[PDB]
């Protein structure tokens, strides 16, 4: 209902609580070449040696991922210089917090 002279104003309010869930970190994992690709046998390690330097790249990438996950979970939370503690007595003007 719009017109050049009409203003609506609320007379009451309600307090609501809304939630939202955010991921932070994955599961730090690692895989080793020679145990996986080869059956713990020299007859396979010797052949894989001919292929050069791939496993260094793979292990470096996985280690980088793990370090990044640790840095993420450190950065999201530890934003306060020191740990505080609540007083034993609870007096918050009727507000209930023991949940």
């Amino acid at each position: 209902a719009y017109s050049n002279n009409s203003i609506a104003i609320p007379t009451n309010f309600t307090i609501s609580v809304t939630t939202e869930i955010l991921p932070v970190s994955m599961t730090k994992t690692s895989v080793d070449c020679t145990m996986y690709i080869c059956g713990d046998s020299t007859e396979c390690s010797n052949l894989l040696l001919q292929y050069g330097s791939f496993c260094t790249q793979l292990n470096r990438a996985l280690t980088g991922i793990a370090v990044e996950q640790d840095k993420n979970t450190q950065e999201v939370f530890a934003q306060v210089k020191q740990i505080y503690k609540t007083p034993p007595i609870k007096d918050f003007g009727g507000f209930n917090f023991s949940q």
Partner: protein, 98 residues
């Protein structure tokens, strides 16, 4: 785990994370927001409620004159948020997906 796959435990255990979250909540509930800039101060919770209403275009007279009533809604709000997670399992979707 047998073939070649290994998993490394996280650096910070769950207890430490809970301790940080408790510290943040304790700072917010009493110190207000001064501890986010420098040293932690202290101020009653009702005054902080007044100073938060003062930031969205309403004066202090709205809060104090209805203060008791306001508390009820907040409590009732939490009184619902448990039930919203007491039985429904579709709220936690992103974590399960990951």
């Amino acid at each position: 785990k047998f073939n070649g796959l290994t998993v490394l435990p996280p650096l910070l255990t769950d207890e430490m994370i809970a301790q940080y979250t408790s510290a943040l909540l304790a700072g917010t509930i009493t110190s207000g927001w001064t501890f986010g800039a420098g040293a932690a101060l202290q101020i009653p919770f009702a005054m902080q409620m007044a100073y938060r209403f003062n930031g969205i275009g309403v004066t202090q007279n709205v809060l104090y004159e209805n203060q008791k009533l306001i508390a009820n809604q907040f409590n009732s709000a939490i009184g619902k948020i448990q039930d919203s997670l007491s039985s429904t399992a579709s709220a936690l979707g992103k974590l399960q997906n990951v």
